[PDB]
Every structure is written in structure tokens, then in C-alpha cells.
Short mmCIF file of C-alpha atoms in Angstrom, two decimals:
data_model
loop_
_atom_site.label_atom_id
_atom_site.label_comp_id
_atom_site.label_asym_id
_atom_site.label_seq_id
_atom_site.Cartn_x
_atom_site.Cartn_y
_atom_site.Cartn_z
CA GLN A 83 -36.82 -2.49 27.82
CA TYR A 84 -33.02 -2.28 26.34
CA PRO A 85 -31.57 -5.73 26.34
CA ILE A 86 -30.09 -7.90 29.27
CA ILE A 87 -26.47 -9.77 29.56
CA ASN A 88 -26.06 -11.69 32.64
CA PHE A 89 -22.54 -12.69 34.45
CA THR A 90 -21.73 -13.30 38.33
CA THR A 91 -18.49 -13.24 39.63
CA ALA A 92 -19.33 -16.49 40.71
CA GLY A 93 -17.68 -19.63 40.42
CA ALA A 94 -16.40 -17.48 37.39
CA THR A 95 -14.32 -18.82 34.80
CA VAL A 96 -11.76 -18.50 31.66
CA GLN A 97 -15.17 -19.40 29.37
CA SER A 98 -17.73 -18.24 31.12
CA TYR A 99 -16.22 -14.64 30.82
CA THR A 100 -15.32 -14.76 28.08
CA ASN A 101 -18.60 -15.98 26.51
CA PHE A 102 -20.20 -12.27 28.52
CA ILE A 103 -17.52 -10.14 26.42
CA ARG A 104 -18.68 -11.65 22.95
CA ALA A 105 -22.45 -10.97 24.21
CA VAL A 106 -21.07 -7.59 25.04
CA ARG A 107 -19.87 -7.36 22.16
CA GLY A 108 -23.24 -8.61 20.08
CA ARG A 109 -25.25 -6.21 22.04
CA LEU A 110 -23.41 -3.08 21.56
CA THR A 111 -22.73 -3.45 17.23
CA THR A 112 -24.73 -4.95 14.71
CA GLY A 113 -22.46 -6.31 11.69
CA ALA A 114 -22.97 -3.44 9.58
CA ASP A 115 -19.91 -0.59 9.76
CA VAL A 116 -16.47 -3.07 9.33
CA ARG A 117 -13.42 -1.13 8.63
CA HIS A 118 -10.09 -3.67 8.35
CA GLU A 119 -11.48 -6.81 9.63
CA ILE A 120 -12.42 -4.27 12.73
CA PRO A 121 -16.63 -3.28 13.89
CA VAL A 122 -17.74 -0.21 15.05
CA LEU A 123 -19.31 1.27 17.10
CA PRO A 124 -22.52 2.13 15.87
CA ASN A 125 -23.26 6.56 15.21
CA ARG A 126 -24.43 8.40 17.47
CA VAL A 127 -25.63 10.47 15.38
CA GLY A 128 -29.10 9.73 14.69
CA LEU A 129 -28.73 6.87 17.19
CA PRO A 130 -32.85 6.02 18.03
CA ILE A 131 -33.42 6.29 21.75
CA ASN A 132 -34.62 2.36 21.62
CA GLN A 133 -31.12 0.98 20.22
CA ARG A 134 -28.34 3.76 22.50
CA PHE A 135 -28.41 1.75 25.22
CA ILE A 136 -27.57 -1.66 26.73
CA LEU A 137 -27.31 -3.55 29.86
CA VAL A 138 -24.98 -5.84 31.93
CA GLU A 139 -26.61 -7.02 35.78
CA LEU A 140 -23.57 -8.09 37.48
CA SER A 141 -23.73 -10.73 40.60
CA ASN A 142 -21.59 -12.17 43.26
CA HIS A 143 -20.96 -15.32 44.92
CA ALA A 144 -22.97 -12.37 47.49
CA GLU A 145 -25.78 -12.51 45.87
CA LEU A 146 -26.42 -9.35 45.25
CA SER A 147 -26.29 -7.99 41.70
CA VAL A 148 -25.67 -4.28 39.69
CA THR A 149 -26.91 -3.57 37.27
CA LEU A 150 -24.43 -1.45 34.99
CA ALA A 151 -25.60 1.33 31.84
CA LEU A 152 -23.67 1.59 29.00
CA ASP A 153 -23.83 3.88 25.53
CA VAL A 154 -23.37 1.70 22.50
CA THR A 155 -21.88 4.13 20.82
CA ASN A 156 -18.50 4.39 23.17
CA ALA A 157 -18.88 0.53 25.43
CA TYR A 158 -18.11 3.08 28.86
CA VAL A 159 -20.52 2.83 31.92
CA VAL A 160 -22.49 5.17 32.41
CA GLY A 161 -24.67 5.17 35.26
CA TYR A 162 -25.79 1.70 37.66
CA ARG A 163 -28.63 0.73 39.05
CA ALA A 164 -29.08 -0.93 42.70
CA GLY A 165 -32.65 -2.54 44.09
CA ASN A 166 -34.42 1.04 44.22
CA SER A 167 -32.17 3.95 43.11
CA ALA A 168 -29.87 4.42 40.04
CA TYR A 169 -26.77 6.83 39.53
CA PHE A 170 -25.75 8.04 36.38
CA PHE A 171 -22.56 10.19 35.86
CA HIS A 172 -22.60 13.79 34.90
CA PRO A 173 -23.00 14.14 30.92
CA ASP A 174 -21.54 16.20 28.97
CA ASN A 175 -24.01 16.96 27.28
CA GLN A 176 -27.70 18.38 27.71
CA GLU A 177 -27.87 14.72 24.66
CA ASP A 178 -26.56 12.20 27.17
CA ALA A 179 -29.18 14.70 30.23
CA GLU A 180 -31.87 13.53 28.31
CA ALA A 181 -30.86 9.62 26.98
CA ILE A 182 -30.16 8.94 30.34
CA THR A 183 -34.58 9.50 30.92
CA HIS A 184 -34.45 6.49 29.10
CA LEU A 185 -32.95 4.23 31.32
CA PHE A 186 -34.01 2.13 34.68
CA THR A 187 -37.29 4.22 34.40
CA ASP A 188 -39.43 2.42 36.51
CA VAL A 189 -36.68 2.88 39.85
CA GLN A 190 -37.85 5.30 42.95
CA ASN A 191 -34.52 7.31 43.25
CA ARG A 192 -32.58 8.23 40.75
CA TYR A 193 -29.40 10.88 41.34
CA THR A 194 -26.75 12.14 38.93
CA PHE A 195 -23.64 11.68 40.77
CA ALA A 196 -21.97 16.02 39.65
CA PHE A 197 -18.48 14.06 38.15
CA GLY A 198 -18.03 11.49 35.53
CA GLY A 199 -16.28 8.91 34.19
CA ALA A 200 -13.59 9.43 33.03
CA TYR A 201 -10.81 7.75 35.00
CA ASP A 202 -8.33 11.43 35.31
CA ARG A 203 -11.71 12.09 37.60
CA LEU A 204 -12.78 9.32 39.80
CA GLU A 205 -8.28 7.89 40.06
CA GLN A 206 -8.96 11.47 41.68
CA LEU A 207 -11.74 10.42 43.90
CA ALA A 208 -10.89 6.84 44.18
CA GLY A 209 -7.77 8.48 45.81
CA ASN A 210 -4.66 5.54 42.98
CA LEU A 211 -4.05 5.62 39.96
CA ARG A 212 -5.22 2.75 38.21
CA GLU A 213 -1.42 1.25 37.49
CA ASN A 214 -2.44 0.81 41.97
CA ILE A 215 -6.28 -0.37 41.04
CA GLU A 216 -5.72 -4.27 41.19
CA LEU A 217 -8.47 -6.21 38.97
CA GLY A 218 -9.78 -9.74 38.80
CA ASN A 219 -12.19 -11.42 39.58
CA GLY A 220 -11.76 -10.49 43.49
CA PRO A 221 -11.74 -7.38 43.06
CA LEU A 222 -14.98 -7.34 40.70
CA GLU A 223 -16.73 -9.52 43.49
CA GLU A 224 -15.93 -6.88 45.66
CA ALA A 225 -16.39 -3.87 43.87
CA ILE A 226 -20.16 -5.10 42.66
CA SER A 227 -21.33 -4.75 46.24
CA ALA A 228 -19.56 -2.05 47.10
CA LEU A 229 -21.59 -0.34 43.94
CA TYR A 230 -24.32 -2.26 45.25
CA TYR A 231 -24.06 -1.16 49.25
CA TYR A 232 -23.58 2.96 48.13
CA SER A 233 -27.02 3.72 48.56
CA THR A 234 -27.34 2.54 52.33
CA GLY A 235 -24.25 4.73 53.70
CA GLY A 236 -22.02 1.42 53.31
CA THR A 237 -19.36 2.54 50.45
CA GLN A 238 -16.81 6.18 50.96
CA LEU A 239 -16.79 7.88 47.82
CA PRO A 240 -13.05 6.64 47.33
CA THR A 241 -14.67 3.02 47.43
CA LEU A 242 -17.00 3.33 44.73
CA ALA A 243 -14.69 5.35 42.70
CA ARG A 244 -12.79 2.79 42.60
CA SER A 245 -15.20 0.25 42.51
CA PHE A 246 -15.88 2.27 39.86
CA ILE A 247 -12.55 2.38 38.19
CA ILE A 248 -12.42 -2.30 37.92
CA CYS A 249 -15.98 -2.52 36.90
CA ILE A 250 -14.67 -0.18 33.26
CA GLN A 251 -12.16 -1.70 32.91
CA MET A 252 -13.40 -5.17 33.30
CA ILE A 253 -16.10 -4.99 31.61
CA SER A 254 -16.42 -1.33 28.94
CA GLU A 255 -12.23 -1.92 27.88
CA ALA A 256 -12.79 -5.74 27.80
CA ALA A 257 -15.07 -5.28 25.87
CA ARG A 258 -12.96 -2.47 23.11
CA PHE A 259 -10.16 -5.17 23.30
CA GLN A 260 -9.18 -8.26 22.75
CA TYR A 261 -5.85 -7.91 24.77
CA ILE A 262 -7.43 -6.38 27.35
CA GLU A 263 -10.00 -9.31 27.46
CA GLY A 264 -7.28 -11.53 27.05
CA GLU A 265 -5.12 -10.27 30.81
CA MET A 266 -8.85 -10.49 33.14
CA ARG A 267 -9.19 -14.95 31.58
CA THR A 268 -5.58 -15.09 32.29
CA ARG A 269 -6.59 -13.81 35.39
CA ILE A 270 -9.50 -15.41 35.59
CA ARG A 271 -7.52 -18.54 35.07
CA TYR A 272 -4.61 -18.57 37.79
CA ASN A 273 -7.23 -16.64 39.54
CA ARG A 274 -4.83 -13.61 39.82
CA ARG A 275 -5.24 -10.00 40.54
CA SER A 276 -2.86 -7.50 39.69
CA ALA A 277 -3.18 -4.16 38.60
CA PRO A 278 -3.04 -2.79 34.55
CA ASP A 279 0.34 -3.56 33.22
CA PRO A 280 1.35 -0.01 30.61
CA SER A 281 0.10 -2.40 27.36
CA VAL A 282 -3.74 -2.15 29.77
CA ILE A 283 -3.19 1.56 30.55
CA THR A 284 -1.85 2.79 27.30
CA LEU A 285 -4.74 1.16 25.54
CA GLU A 286 -7.06 2.40 27.68
CA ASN A 287 -5.97 5.91 27.27
CA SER A 288 -5.75 5.12 23.04
CA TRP A 289 -8.72 3.59 21.95
CA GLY A 290 -9.79 7.39 20.94
CA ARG A 291 -6.68 8.68 19.24
CA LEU A 292 -6.72 4.49 17.69
CA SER A 293 -10.53 4.72 16.24
CA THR A 294 -9.32 8.14 14.49
CA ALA A 295 -5.96 7.13 13.20
CA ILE A 296 -7.47 3.26 11.64
CA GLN A 297 -10.39 5.35 10.10
CA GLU A 298 -8.53 8.16 9.11
CA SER A 299 -5.91 6.29 7.87
CA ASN A 300 -4.10 5.69 4.38
CA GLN A 301 -5.69 1.56 3.05
CA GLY A 302 -5.17 0.67 6.65
CA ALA A 303 -1.15 3.18 6.94
CA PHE A 304 -1.58 5.84 9.55
CA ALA A 305 -0.67 9.50 8.67
CA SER A 306 1.67 9.13 12.40
CA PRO A 307 1.96 6.74 14.34
CA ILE A 308 0.30 5.98 17.68
CA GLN A 309 2.96 4.97 20.83
CA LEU A 310 1.74 2.63 23.14
CA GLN A 311 4.14 0.25 26.34
CA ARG A 312 4.86 -3.06 26.45
CA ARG A 313 3.62 -5.30 29.29
CA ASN A 314 7.80 -3.99 30.79
CA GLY A 315 6.64 -0.46 30.18
CA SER A 316 8.81 0.57 26.72
CA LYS A 317 7.72 1.81 23.96
CA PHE A 318 5.77 -0.25 20.84
CA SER A 319 5.68 2.22 18.20
CA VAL A 320 2.14 1.48 15.62
CA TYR A 321 2.42 2.35 12.56
CA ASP A 322 -0.86 -0.09 10.86
CA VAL A 323 -3.70 -0.93 11.38
CA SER A 324 -2.68 -4.05 10.90
CA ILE A 325 -0.63 -5.07 13.82
CA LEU A 326 -3.75 -4.17 15.83
CA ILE A 327 -6.01 -6.39 14.49
CA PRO A 328 -5.59 -9.52 17.09
CA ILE A 329 -5.73 -6.97 19.66
CA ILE A 330 -8.49 -4.11 19.18
CA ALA A 331 -11.97 -5.17 19.01
CA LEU A 332 -14.54 -2.21 18.54
CA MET A 333 -13.90 1.17 17.63
CA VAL A 334 -15.54 4.10 18.61
CA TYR A 335 -17.29 5.72 14.96
CA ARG A 336 -15.15 8.17 13.25
CA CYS A 337 -15.43 9.45 10.06
CA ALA A 338 -17.85 7.21 7.60
CA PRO A 339 -15.55 5.12 5.72
CA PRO A 340 -13.90 6.14 1.81
CA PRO A 341 -15.65 4.46 -0.94
CA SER A 342 -13.80 1.01 -1.59
CA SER A 343 -11.88 2.34 -3.78
CA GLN A 344 -9.86 -1.23 -4.51
CA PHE A 345 -7.70 -1.60 -7.76
CA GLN B 82 14.93 -32.39 -13.92
CA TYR B 83 13.64 -29.23 -13.00
CA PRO B 84 9.86 -28.95 -12.85
CA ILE B 85 7.76 -29.27 -15.53
CA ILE B 86 4.17 -28.13 -15.62
CA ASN B 87 3.17 -28.03 -18.87
CA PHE B 88 -0.35 -25.42 -20.64
CA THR B 89 -2.04 -25.21 -24.76
CA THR B 90 -3.68 -22.64 -26.06
CA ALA B 91 -5.25 -25.49 -28.48
CA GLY B 92 -8.86 -25.39 -26.56
CA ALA B 93 -7.82 -22.95 -23.75
CA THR B 94 -10.60 -22.72 -20.86
CA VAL B 95 -10.31 -20.47 -17.59
CA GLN B 96 -10.30 -22.56 -16.63
CA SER B 97 -7.37 -24.47 -17.42
CA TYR B 98 -5.04 -21.17 -18.04
CA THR B 99 -6.59 -21.13 -13.86
CA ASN B 100 -5.28 -24.74 -13.43
CA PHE B 101 -2.02 -23.45 -15.09
CA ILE B 102 -0.97 -20.21 -13.60
CA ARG B 103 -1.71 -22.21 -10.12
CA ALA B 104 0.46 -24.73 -10.46
CA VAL B 105 3.55 -22.36 -11.89
CA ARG B 106 2.74 -20.69 -8.90
CA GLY B 107 3.01 -23.86 -6.76
CA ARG B 108 6.81 -24.08 -8.66
CA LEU B 109 7.79 -21.15 -8.00
CA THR B 110 7.58 -20.81 -4.57
CA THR B 111 7.83 -23.23 -1.06
CA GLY B 112 5.08 -21.54 1.43
CA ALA B 113 8.37 -20.70 3.31
CA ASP B 114 7.60 -17.17 3.07
CA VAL B 115 4.66 -15.54 3.27
CA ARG B 116 4.36 -12.08 4.89
CA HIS B 117 1.01 -10.02 4.52
CA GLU B 118 -0.27 -13.03 3.05
CA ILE B 119 1.63 -12.96 0.30
CA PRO B 120 4.22 -15.03 -0.81
CA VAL B 121 8.15 -14.21 -1.51
CA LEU B 122 10.05 -16.40 -3.81
CA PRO B 123 12.92 -17.98 -2.60
CA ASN B 124 16.39 -15.76 -1.85
CA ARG B 125 19.36 -16.16 -5.04
CA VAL B 126 21.72 -16.04 -1.66
CA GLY B 127 22.92 -20.01 -1.65
CA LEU B 128 19.68 -21.22 -4.01
CA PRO B 129 20.79 -24.29 -4.42
CA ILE B 130 21.08 -25.03 -8.29
CA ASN B 131 19.11 -27.63 -8.47
CA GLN B 132 16.74 -25.33 -7.30
CA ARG B 133 16.26 -22.39 -8.78
CA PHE B 134 15.07 -23.38 -12.90
CA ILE B 135 11.49 -24.32 -13.58
CA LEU B 136 10.43 -25.19 -17.07
CA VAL B 137 6.94 -24.03 -19.22
CA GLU B 138 5.65 -26.30 -22.12
CA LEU B 139 3.75 -24.67 -24.31
CA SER B 140 1.67 -26.42 -26.66
CA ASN B 141 -0.70 -25.16 -29.49
CA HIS B 142 -3.35 -26.61 -31.57
CA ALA B 143 -0.75 -25.92 -34.19
CA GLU B 144 1.39 -29.62 -32.69
CA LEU B 145 3.98 -27.10 -31.86
CA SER B 146 5.75 -27.18 -28.54
CA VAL B 147 8.31 -24.55 -27.29
CA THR B 148 10.01 -24.82 -23.36
CA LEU B 149 10.47 -21.94 -21.31
CA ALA B 150 13.16 -22.04 -18.57
CA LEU B 151 11.90 -19.43 -15.89
CA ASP B 152 14.37 -18.68 -12.37
CA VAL B 153 12.63 -19.21 -9.98
CA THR B 154 14.40 -16.37 -8.11
CA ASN B 155 12.05 -13.65 -9.91
CA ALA B 156 9.52 -15.86 -12.00
CA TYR B 157 11.14 -15.03 -15.36
CA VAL B 158 12.22 -16.27 -18.66
CA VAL B 159 15.68 -16.89 -18.96
CA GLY B 160 15.46 -19.21 -22.29
CA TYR B 161 13.94 -21.58 -24.72
CA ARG B 162 13.71 -24.69 -25.83
CA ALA B 163 12.22 -26.11 -29.49
CA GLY B 164 13.53 -29.49 -30.76
CA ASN B 165 17.11 -29.76 -31.18
CA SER B 166 17.34 -25.57 -30.67
CA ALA B 167 17.76 -23.61 -26.86
CA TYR B 168 17.91 -20.03 -26.97
CA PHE B 169 18.52 -17.26 -22.95
CA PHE B 170 18.66 -14.36 -22.54
CA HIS B 171 22.43 -12.24 -23.00
CA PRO B 172 23.11 -13.55 -18.61
CA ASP B 173 23.40 -10.42 -16.03
CA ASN B 174 26.11 -11.78 -14.53
CA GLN B 175 29.19 -15.05 -14.01
CA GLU B 176 26.66 -16.97 -11.51
CA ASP B 177 23.00 -16.62 -13.79
CA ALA B 178 26.17 -17.47 -17.08
CA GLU B 179 26.65 -20.98 -15.52
CA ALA B 180 23.38 -21.50 -14.05
CA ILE B 181 21.59 -21.31 -17.68
CA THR B 182 24.25 -24.02 -18.41
CA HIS B 183 22.07 -26.08 -16.74
CA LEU B 184 18.94 -25.70 -19.19
CA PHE B 185 18.46 -28.16 -21.57
CA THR B 186 21.85 -29.54 -20.80
CA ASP B 187 21.24 -32.38 -24.03
CA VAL B 188 20.24 -29.76 -26.63
CA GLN B 189 22.89 -30.55 -29.51
CA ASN B 190 22.59 -26.34 -30.75
CA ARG B 191 23.14 -23.87 -27.86
CA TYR B 192 22.56 -20.31 -28.75
CA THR B 193 23.20 -16.95 -26.19
CA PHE B 194 21.76 -14.06 -27.44
CA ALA B 195 23.19 -10.65 -26.97
CA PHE B 196 20.34 -8.86 -25.68
CA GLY B 197 18.72 -10.10 -22.48
CA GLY B 198 14.87 -10.05 -22.33
CA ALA B 199 14.05 -7.23 -19.60
CA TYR B 200 10.97 -4.81 -21.86
CA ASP B 201 12.38 -1.98 -23.16
CA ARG B 202 14.94 -3.89 -24.72
CA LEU B 203 11.79 -6.08 -26.01
CA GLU B 204 10.37 -3.83 -26.66
CA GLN B 205 13.30 -2.04 -28.77
CA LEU B 206 14.03 -5.53 -31.63
CA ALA B 207 10.44 -5.72 -31.96
CA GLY B 208 10.00 -2.48 -33.43
CA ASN B 209 6.75 -1.92 -30.80
CA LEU B 210 6.12 -1.32 -27.11
CA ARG B 211 3.58 -3.14 -24.55
CA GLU B 212 0.96 -0.80 -25.10
CA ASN B 213 0.77 -2.45 -28.38
CA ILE B 214 1.15 -5.61 -28.89
CA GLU B 215 -2.04 -8.15 -28.03
CA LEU B 216 -2.46 -10.15 -25.54
CA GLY B 217 -4.42 -13.61 -25.74
CA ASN B 218 -5.42 -17.21 -26.69
CA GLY B 219 -4.61 -16.05 -30.03
CA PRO B 220 -1.64 -14.23 -29.40
CA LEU B 221 0.44 -16.94 -27.65
CA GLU B 222 -1.31 -19.37 -29.99
CA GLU B 223 1.25 -18.10 -32.85
CA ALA B 224 3.75 -16.75 -30.67
CA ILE B 225 4.45 -20.56 -29.59
CA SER B 226 4.64 -20.54 -33.26
CA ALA B 227 7.52 -17.79 -34.01
CA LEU B 228 10.10 -19.36 -30.81
CA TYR B 229 9.15 -22.91 -32.62
CA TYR B 230 10.02 -21.43 -36.38
CA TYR B 231 14.07 -19.60 -35.33
CA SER B 232 16.29 -21.62 -35.48
CA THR B 233 14.74 -22.31 -39.34
CA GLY B 234 14.50 -18.45 -40.07
CA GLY B 235 11.16 -18.63 -40.58
CA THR B 236 10.53 -15.79 -37.51
CA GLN B 237 12.69 -12.25 -37.79
CA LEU B 238 13.21 -11.09 -35.14
CA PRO B 239 10.53 -7.50 -34.07
CA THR B 240 8.47 -11.31 -34.36
CA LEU B 241 11.13 -13.58 -32.44
CA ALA B 242 10.66 -10.68 -29.42
CA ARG B 243 6.90 -9.80 -29.95
CA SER B 244 6.05 -13.23 -28.92
CA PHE B 245 8.62 -13.03 -26.08
CA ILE B 246 6.60 -10.15 -24.66
CA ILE B 247 3.40 -12.42 -24.86
CA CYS B 248 4.65 -15.01 -23.27
CA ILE B 249 6.06 -13.31 -20.59
CA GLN B 250 3.64 -11.10 -19.96
CA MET B 251 1.30 -14.04 -19.84
CA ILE B 252 3.38 -16.35 -18.23
CA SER B 253 5.95 -14.57 -15.49
CA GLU B 254 3.34 -11.33 -15.23
CA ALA B 255 -0.13 -13.26 -14.87
CA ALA B 256 1.84 -15.63 -11.72
CA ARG B 257 3.61 -11.86 -10.02
CA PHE B 258 -0.37 -10.84 -10.25
CA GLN B 259 -3.43 -12.42 -9.69
CA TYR B 260 -5.19 -9.22 -11.56
CA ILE B 261 -3.18 -9.64 -14.73
CA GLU B 262 -3.82 -13.07 -14.41
CA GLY B 263 -7.25 -11.36 -14.30
CA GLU B 264 -6.95 -9.92 -17.39
CA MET B 265 -5.98 -12.79 -19.70
CA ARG B 266 -8.94 -15.00 -18.15
CA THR B 267 -11.33 -12.53 -19.35
CA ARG B 268 -9.44 -13.19 -22.86
CA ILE B 269 -10.25 -16.85 -23.25
CA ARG B 270 -13.21 -15.71 -21.28
CA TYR B 271 -15.09 -13.43 -24.69
CA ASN B 272 -12.23 -15.16 -27.11
CA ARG B 273 -10.72 -11.18 -26.95
CA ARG B 274 -7.05 -10.38 -28.48
CA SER B 275 -6.51 -6.73 -27.02
CA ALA B 276 -3.39 -4.85 -25.78
CA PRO B 277 -2.23 -4.73 -22.74
CA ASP B 278 -3.39 -0.89 -20.42
CA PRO B 279 -2.26 1.40 -18.43
CA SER B 280 -2.64 -1.20 -14.69
CA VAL B 281 -1.21 -3.44 -16.34
CA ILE B 282 1.76 -1.90 -17.72
CA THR B 283 1.65 -0.72 -14.07
CA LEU B 284 1.87 -3.47 -12.52
CA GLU B 285 4.65 -4.72 -14.62
CA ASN B 286 6.53 -2.01 -14.63
CA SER B 287 6.00 -2.00 -10.20
CA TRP B 288 6.54 -5.41 -9.40
CA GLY B 289 10.40 -4.78 -7.92
CA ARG B 290 9.32 -1.59 -6.03
CA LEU B 291 5.92 -3.13 -4.41
CA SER B 292 8.05 -6.01 -3.58
CA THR B 293 10.69 -4.34 -1.72
CA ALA B 294 7.89 -1.87 -0.33
CA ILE B 295 5.82 -4.28 1.25
CA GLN B 296 9.34 -6.35 2.73
CA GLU B 297 10.51 -2.70 3.78
CA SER B 298 6.93 -1.44 4.81
CA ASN B 299 6.58 -0.22 8.98
CA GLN B 300 3.58 -2.96 9.50
CA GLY B 301 2.29 -2.90 5.47
CA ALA B 302 2.38 1.34 5.46
CA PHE B 303 5.25 2.16 2.52
CA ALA B 304 7.40 5.05 3.83
CA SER B 305 6.55 6.75 0.24
CA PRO B 306 3.47 6.00 -2.08
CA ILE B 307 4.21 4.28 -5.57
CA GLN B 308 1.57 6.20 -8.05
CA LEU B 309 0.25 2.92 -10.69
CA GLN B 310 -2.29 3.00 -13.09
CA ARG B 311 -6.20 2.26 -13.41
CA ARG B 312 -7.40 1.09 -16.79
CA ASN B 313 -8.75 3.90 -18.05
CA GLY B 314 -5.00 5.44 -16.82
CA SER B 315 -6.10 7.40 -14.44
CA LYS B 316 -3.36 7.78 -11.27
CA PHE B 317 -4.15 5.27 -8.36
CA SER B 318 -1.65 5.90 -5.29
CA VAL B 319 -0.89 3.03 -3.62
CA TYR B 320 0.42 3.58 0.35
CA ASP B 321 -0.45 0.42 2.69
CA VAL B 322 0.19 -3.17 0.99
CA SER B 323 -3.24 -4.40 1.90
CA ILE B 324 -4.59 -2.88 -1.15
CA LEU B 325 -2.18 -5.47 -2.70
CA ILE B 326 -3.46 -8.53 -1.62
CA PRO B 327 -6.29 -9.84 -4.09
CA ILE B 328 -3.58 -7.76 -6.57
CA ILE B 329 0.01 -9.14 -6.37
CA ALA B 330 0.38 -12.91 -5.91
CA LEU B 331 4.40 -13.49 -5.14
CA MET B 332 7.56 -10.70 -5.07
CA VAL B 333 10.69 -10.95 -4.83
CA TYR B 334 13.05 -12.40 -2.90
CA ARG B 335 14.22 -8.25 -0.86
CA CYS B 336 15.37 -7.83 2.26
CA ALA B 337 14.74 -10.86 5.38
CA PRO B 338 11.27 -10.07 7.00
CA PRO B 339 11.87 -8.55 10.94
CA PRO B 340 11.12 -9.81 13.32
CA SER B 341 7.91 -11.13 14.55
CA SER B 342 6.94 -8.24 16.80
CA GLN B 343 3.78 -8.19 17.86
CA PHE B 344 2.05 -6.62 20.83
#
């Protein structure tokens, strides 16, 4: 079976969420590939199917559980199981449709959504942008129950889409960015629920481009800057990998690392 | 008295030269100013005279000694004492002429050369470029004796200029660059004497510009690349501070560090 990492919202603390995110990152990346102190996820090209996914079993104080499946190549959620039903985002291509047949293989009811899991899509479905969907331990407890009751009719599609938005940010994006993990740790420490500020949204939006820019940089120097936002919405220009080392924890593979070429 | 660091060529080893260079760097820089893991020398502006120099007492197997004086603001040799005579390079300006009156104050004979200590000058005087002046423990033993016999007529000006070229590279440039320290350590380990290769010459020539480029970089990214040479003469372009962290050990102060401006 693919590796499983467990997390519960019931009695969550900063340390139990930290342990969880660190365990997720350790199953996503192997150590082989670290560019500028920043690990790279495995290359999808040639990756054996037995190494392609990991599972995140989420429980809540209401004693419900769902299992999310994450693709190791991008850390993103591809689907989930609740009891005897599994649901998958619409695949991007045939190889990804075949790959997801290897997940939750004994579940009795398997479904593929006709929509994908990208935020533009999920925000249309939810009827709200990320900037208007609160994150924190209470949102996540609620999102776990909403995913669990979907197959029985208790969850309307906008709630299910909002619930995916919450899970993806609090698991996938936190795994990708220590900064976003830190914002979720602060919400647990102060028992706050609050929508993501523009620093969180622009890091999420820029993860792919930051990955490419780091990996195609000249000795760390970007060829072209990337504009992010600070918490108050003002502009932050990124010219080099160095400023991202405390921020980004993993990258999607975009090219092979150039030869070491030390002086 | 200004701090003194002792070194002898007699029975020198890789470890005794390593200890020496590390002690020199510890007296040149204080720790206050470190940009990209690379220390900065003190700013000359406002630096009290009692903090302006350090002294390097060099002895050899012939039981002769000379004392070089180094300016902490650039690590370079400003003059030297041998017994009852002291000699100083021609100062660049009035403040530097006054500053050197604070060195070797009880020496009976004080002289200022009419020439400065820059390599273009010293190579004209020596009648040879750096690329044709061997470095190593034997050159340095010889250069110490040549400096010691200058006041008595035993050293011709081209030998004295060659001897300054040897000392400046094996002390100042080795302090400035771990790479150049490493090339001198290899000469001692294998008892080799050999002229500096183009990697050593182009680092020496570029120290000032590398200092400015690092300090005025955008998060480590140079605005304009710096071309160096590898040992075989071929071109090496530097686009970022990261590649220099194993190479350059100290920099001349060129600007104040911008605000931390972390994300």
C-alpha cells in the first residue's frame, strides 16, 4: 500500500501539525534532489506507479475520517476516499487517469468528477474565492465532515468545493511552503480561523513559476523577477533563490540540475 | 600596539599556514558585518586610528624577520619594518599618509617610497608580471630575506618589488580568498613553487569588483556578471554570490547592507 500519514483536528496543536507536515514532506521527497537547499519532488518521467502517491488520513473530533491521495510529483490532492466511496478529480491526461486506478482499489464505488482540482475551478464551484474562505482547525474539522457526508447527500457541491479548497491549502500548500505551514501553525496556536492573506494566495499562485525560476536560475539568480505580495497586499519582488530558502520547502521538478560547475 | 600575528616559513606546513591565515582574518574583521555568509572588512569612514592596522611578523629559516603592516580596511600591505628601518608605500591621500605615521613609531629610519603597492606598479619595478613570479614557501623565505637586506644595499629594486608581490599574494590575497589560501596550502603540501595560474590572477584583479557586486546585488543576484578565469585560462562567468561563498573570505566595505527585507 502507498505510505499513509495520519493527522487529526481533534486536539490539534502546533506541534502535532508540525509533525504531520514534516512527515508528509518526508514521504513526498526522497532526498535525492536538492537545489539551493530546496528539495525537489520526484520527476514524473519514468516514476514507477508504486512510488507515485501517498495517502493522508484525516480524522476529526466528530470521529469521522477521510483519506486524501496526493501525487508525489506535485504534492497536490488527486482524490479522496470516505468509507465505501472514492472520488477523483478529473484527470489532465490518459497517464494520470490510468495512474489513479491504482488508488483505493478495493473501494466499492469509484467516481471521477468532471471537474479538476485547480483553484479557479473549485472557487467557481464554491461560489467564493480563497480570499473569502476561512482556514484553521475549525475549517478543517468542518471540511473533513463535509467530505465524509458527500456520498450520502448531506454536502452540497459548493460546500464540497470549499472543503477541497481548505484541505488543499492546509495540507498540500503547507507541505510546499514553510511559510504557509507557519500561517496554519499560528491559526492553531491562537485558535483563529481566517482567510488567507495575499502573501499566502500569491505564493500558492506562484509555486510553479518559483519552481522553474529557481531551477533555471543562473547560480540562484533569476533571469526575470517574480512578484509576490506581502501580507498587506504590497508588492515583494523576488530576484534570487536566497530569499526563498525560508519560504519554499519543495518544488515540482522542472529541469535537470545543471552540472555542478564550481569554480 | 596594533595586534601582531606571527608566521614562519621555517618548517611551515599546511596546518601552520592555515592557522596563520585564520588568525589574520580574525584580526582583520570583527564579526559585525557578514553579507551572504561573507564577512566585510571595517568601513574606513569613521574608523579610529587605533583600530586601523594589524601587523604580520614574518620569520624564515635564515633567522631573519620583517614586520608587514596591513590596513584592516582592505587587507593590503602598507609598509614594513626590518630592524631599525621602516618603509611605506606611497600613500593615496593625506588621510592615509597621516595614518601610517602611527605605525612603527619608534623606528629610527622611516622612509616612504615614491611608488605605491599596486601590482601594475610593482610588476613594472620587478620587470615581471605576477604570472611569471613563483609563489610558495621557498619564494616567501627568499622574499623575507630580500626585505630584510634592503636597507643595507643587498637588495636591488626589482628583487624588492618581486618580494612585495610574493608577500602581498601569500598573505593579503590568501586572507581575502580561501581559494588563494588553498593554492598556497597545496604549494606547501607538495613543496612546489609555481607562479599563480589565471584563476589566482583574475580573483586578485576582481576582488574590488566582486566586493561591490555582492554588496549591491539584488538578494545575491548580480546586476551584471563578472568574468573570471579557471586554472586553464578559460572563462568562468559569476552571476551570483552563491558560487563565491567557498572562494572569497572577506570583502572591502562598499555600501551599507540594505534593510533585511525578508518576506
